[PDB]
Amino acid sequence: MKTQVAIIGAGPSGLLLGQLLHKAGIDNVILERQTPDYVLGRIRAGVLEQGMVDLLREAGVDRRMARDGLVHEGVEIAFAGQRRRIDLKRLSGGKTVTVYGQTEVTRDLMEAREACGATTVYQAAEVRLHDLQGERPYVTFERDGERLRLDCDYIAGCDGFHGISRQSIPAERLKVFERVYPFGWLGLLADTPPVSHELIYANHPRGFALCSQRSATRSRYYVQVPLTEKVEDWSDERFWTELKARLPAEVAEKLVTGPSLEKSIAPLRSFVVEPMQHGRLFLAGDAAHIVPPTGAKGLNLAASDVSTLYRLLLKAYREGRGELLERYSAICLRRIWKAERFSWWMTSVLHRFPDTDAFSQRIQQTELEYYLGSEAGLATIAENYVGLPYE
Amino acid sequence: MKTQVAIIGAGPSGLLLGQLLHKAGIDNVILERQTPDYVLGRIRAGVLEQGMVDLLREAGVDRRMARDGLVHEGVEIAFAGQRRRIDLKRLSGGKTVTVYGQTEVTRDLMEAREACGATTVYQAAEVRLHDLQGERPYVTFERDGERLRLDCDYIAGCDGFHGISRQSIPAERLKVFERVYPFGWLGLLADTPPVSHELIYANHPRGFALCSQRSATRSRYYVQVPLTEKVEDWSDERFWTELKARLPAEVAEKLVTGPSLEKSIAPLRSFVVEPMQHGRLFLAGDAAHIVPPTGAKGLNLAASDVSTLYRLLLKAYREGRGELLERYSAICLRRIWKAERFSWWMTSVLHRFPDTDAFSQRIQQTELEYYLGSEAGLATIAENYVGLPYE
Ligand SMILES: Nc1ncnc2c1ncn2[C@@H]1O[C@H](COP(=O)(O)OP(=O)(O)OC[C@H]2O[C@@H](O)[C@H](O)[C@@H]2O)[C@@H](O)[C@H]1O
Ligand SMILES: Nc1ncnc2c1ncn2[C@@H]1O[C@H](COP(=O)(O)OP(=O)(O)OC[C@H]2O[C@@H](O)[C@H](O)[C@@H]2O)[C@@H](O)[C@H]1O
Numbered sequence: 001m002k003t004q005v006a007i008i009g010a011g012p013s014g015l016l017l018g019q020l021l022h023k024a025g026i027d028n029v030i031l032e033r034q035t036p037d038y039v040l041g042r043i044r045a046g047v048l049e050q051g052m053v054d055l056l057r058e059a060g061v062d063r064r065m066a067r068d069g070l071v072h073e074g075v076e077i078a079f080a081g082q083r084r085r086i087d088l089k090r091l092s093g094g095k096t097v098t099v100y101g102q103t104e105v106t107r108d109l110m111e112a113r114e115a116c117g118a119t120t121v122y123q124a125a126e127v128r129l130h131d132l133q134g135e136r137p138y139v140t141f142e143r144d145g146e147r148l149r150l151d152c153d154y155i156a157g158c159d160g161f162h163g164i165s166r167q168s169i170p171a172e173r174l175k176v177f178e179r180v181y182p183f184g185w186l187g188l189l190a191d192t193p194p195v196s197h198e199l200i201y202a203n204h205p206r207g208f209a210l211c212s213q214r215s216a217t218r219s220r221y222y223v224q225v226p227l228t229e230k231v232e233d234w235s236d237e238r239f240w241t242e243l244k245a246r247l248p249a250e251v252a253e254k255l256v257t258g259p260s261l262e263k264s265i266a267p268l269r270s271f272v273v274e275p276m277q278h279g280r281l282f283l284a285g286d287a288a289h290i291v292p293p294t295g296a297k298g299l300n301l302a303a304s305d306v307s308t309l310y311r312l313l314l315k316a317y318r319e320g321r322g323e324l325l326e327r328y329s330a331i332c333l334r335r336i337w338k339a340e341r342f343s344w345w346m347t348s349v350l351h352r353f354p355d356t357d358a359f360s361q362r363i364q365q366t367e368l369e370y371y372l373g374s375e376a377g378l379a380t381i382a383e384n385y386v387g388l389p390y391e
Numbered sequence: 392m393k394t395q396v397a398i399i400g401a402g403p404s405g406l407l408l409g410q411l412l413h414k415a416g417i418d419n420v421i422l423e424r425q426t427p428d429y430v431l432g433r434i435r436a437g438v439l440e441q442g443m444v445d446l447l448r449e450a451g452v453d454r455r456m457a458r459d460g461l462v463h464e465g466v467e468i469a470f471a472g473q474r475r476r477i478d479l480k481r482l483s484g485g486k487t488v489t490v491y492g493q494t495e496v497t498r499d500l501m502e503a504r505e506a507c508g509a510t511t512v513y514q515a516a517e518v519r520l521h522d523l524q525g526e527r528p529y530v531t532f533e534r535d536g537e538r539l540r541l542d543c544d545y546i547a548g549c550d551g552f553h554g555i556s557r558q559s560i561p562a563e564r565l566k567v568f569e570r571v572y573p574f575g576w577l578g579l580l581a582d583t584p585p586v587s588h589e590l591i592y593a594n595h596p597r598g599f600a601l602c603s604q605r606s607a608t609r610s611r612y613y614v615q616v617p618l619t620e621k622v623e624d625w626s627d628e629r630f631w632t633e634l635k636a637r638l639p640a641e642v643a644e645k646l647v648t649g650p651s652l653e654k655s656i657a658p659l660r661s662f663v664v665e666p667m668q669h670g671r672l673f674l675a676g677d678a679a680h681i682v683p684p685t686g687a688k689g690l691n692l693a694a695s696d697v698s699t700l701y702r703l704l705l706k707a708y709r710e711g712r713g714e715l716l717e718r719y720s721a722i723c724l725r726r727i728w729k730a731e732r733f734s735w736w737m738t739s740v741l742h743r744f745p746d747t748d749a750f751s752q753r754i755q756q757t758e759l760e761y762y763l764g765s766e767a768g769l770a771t772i773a774e775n776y777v778g779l780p781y782e
Binding site: 091175176177178179270272337338340341342344357358359360362363365366367369370374375376377378379380382383 | 482566567568569570661663728729731732733735748749750751753754756757758760761765766767768769770771773774
């Protein structure tokens with residue numbers, strides 16, 4: 001085998017780049033370690049900004065989304081006492097966000113692909129990247145116990161956080177910026193009516209609480225917990241009381257509980273890599289950067305990454321401007337940091353930090369009461385929450 | 392002696408409350424430890440928001456100010472690389488700030504007072520506050536080695552940070568919030584033309600640098616320095632090179648240097664007290680709270696404090712609503728924290744913090760590049776820099 005752009009990872013990022021390119025007439029090849037249902041089982045994401053939406057539209061993958069995802073013109077911040085709302089739609093000067101699961105997106109790209117007959121090597125083991133700065137790089141992998149070769153012009157490093165991509169870059173060439181938070185998020189999935197027609201982010205003494213959704217009958221809920229917690233310990237019951245123990249009084253009494261489909265804990269990490277390239281290797285999505293799930297920016301960053309990588313592969317491909325690919329990481333990085341800054345900010349103000357003296361606690365509160373109180377303040381949550389312009 | 396409101400401290404705060412009340416026909420008495428030139432020698436303050444201005448106007452102390460202070464419609468942030476400006480005047484929806492030294496203000500209230508013949512006991516030693524929660528509190532002090540008594544209805548605790556006021560409040564009754572920064576500000580006063588018709592705040596690798604003014608021919612300059620620095624070590628020369636080493640290239644070459652009048656180091660502290668009252672004692676200005684000199688909020692907070700205390704003393708005095716004085720600290724505290732939050736924010740982003748990893752450094756930068764780049768972002772620096780509305 002030989003192809004044009006061999007992609008590693010059959011996740012959101014990978015499957016997006018993969019589709020987009022197929023349409024542009026640039027042959028691509030997806031290499032994935034696990035099987036398609038395994039990948040299909042991951043819950044993750046739920047909010048996509050307009051950009052990821054239009055992109056979806058652009059790979060012709062928006063039939064379902066346009067039909068089942070929900071449009072949201074607001075959000076809520078419930079901080080010790082009250083509950084303020086943010087008119088994203090008005091303060092963003094017209095924008096919004098969509099609630100449509102990572103899973104759904106994944107199932108949707110996966111359908112498109114199979115249908116177009118684009119290649120996808122599932123369960124491809126021992127993937128390896130070769131001759132990275134040459135005129136012809138390659139990928140070696142195993143099918144059963146058969147080690148094959150895929151010749152390509154470029155490689156799309158889309159294998160996520162624990163992917164092999166980034167690793168393939170000479171450590172000395174890469175500079176790392178990472179922050180690790182002393183807490184996690186315990187996420188319970190319930191086949192029950194969600195507490196609100198909008199999202200409610202709750203900063204409460206006992207920690208953060210999040211009320212989110214999947215449908216009129218599908219809710220997603222979260223509670224911040226020490227890294228030391230084990231879900232084995234969090235039974236439906238415990239969770240339900242802890243949630244209610246964390247929400248606004250009039251919310252909790254409106255709350256419909258039930259057995260959980262899935263329960264998992266995700267640890268909050270802040271991570272960035274610069275540069276995001278190496279030779280003929282371009283890493284995108286999880287493999288280049290991570291964001292605490294708080295500003296729901298994670299899957300939104302991949303889209304921004306892929307939208308970029310794609311449009312540059314096009315020029316080199318149909319317009320022969322191979323040269324622009326060098327600016328890949330200069331472009332992506334502008335977006336990333338402002339996205340990293342917003343989620344950091346988010347996180348710091350809605351979370352229960354252990355070992356914070358009274359000033360800092362007073363300052364946490366002032367942030368909330370400053371920002372949800374002033375229109376200019378408001379406008380900042382809004383231009384970011386909905387997503388900064390693409391460039 | 393007996394009087395109505397006995398004030399401790401013959402500083403800005405004290406002298407303001409003092410004047411204001413004299414005009415309202417509420418007899419007052421000022422008690423000060425040092426002499427009037429000693430007090431007159433303190434350089435401190437240089438920027439007053441509109442509120443402090445109008446207040447000045449209201450005590451009939453604005454002849455000179457209206458004539459010599461300067462009106463500023465902008466500020467500058469020079470962060471590693473470039474130099475962005477903030478149109479406070481446009482983004483505040485019409486507001487400004489005035490550059491008119493603490494010293495000048497002090498000399499101006501001092502003139503008014505003497506003239507109205509209001510009492511002022513200078514060099515009053517061993518001041519002591521008595522029967523604080525009673526129907527008639529008192530102050531005892533010494534004139535030479537003569538210990539006298541001043542009977543009053545209320546006491547205005549205006550003796551600054553190291554004042555006796557706050558101390559007179561039963562420790563157990565007060566709750567303290569204080570942050571102390573690992574650096575100071577070395578301030579040099581020069582009888583030379585200032586580098587700009589506006590202020591320039593400079594975030595540079597080597598630390599913060601500030602370019603300020605007093606006149607067309609009087610400049611004020613600062614450089615952030617470790618708490619361990621001793622001015623004895625900072626000669627004019629050293630300072631001049633360190634400043635230039637910290638500013639924008641095109642600034643430094645425009646810079647006119649010269650011998651310094653005064654040179655001093657001020658350590659940055661963040662401090663708040665709640666509540667600001669005790670019996671018939673009301674502490675205001677420095678004695679209730681401190682702010683790092685960065686958002687130039689310090690003397691602006693006293694004005695906000697005094698404007699409050701005054702207007703409540705009036706009601707009890709001419710309108711007999713003795714009752715409202717209880718809300719003194721509920722009023723002041725709303726303002727204070729938002730003022731404390733702004734200067735904290737200010738400080739954190741323009742200063743060189745030792746032991747900051749690369750993420751946090753990347754995040755510092757993102758703040759600057761986020762906030763001086765977005766209009767909503769801009770609007771936040773602006774509504775605060777010029778001063779939040781009084782209530
Ligand atoms: N060595 C490997 N070879 C091939 N594929 C690999 C390898 N390692 C990992 N992969 C596969 O690549 C995929 C990576 O998926 P994700 O982490 O979801 O990828 P991305 O598209 O970058 O991100 C999606 C979303 O998840 C969040 O973590 C992220 O912030 C974003 O919101 C997984 O299916 C995984 O099995
Ligand atoms: N025991 C005492 N008895 C009488 N007077 C006293 C006593 N202790 C202090 N004082 C006097 O009270 C005055 C306090 O002055 P400042 O600290 O300047 O007071 P304030 O009016 O609260 O603040 C002015 C400005 O300085 C900054 O620190 C502050 O943030 C504000 O910008 C000084 O003259 C000092 O000698």
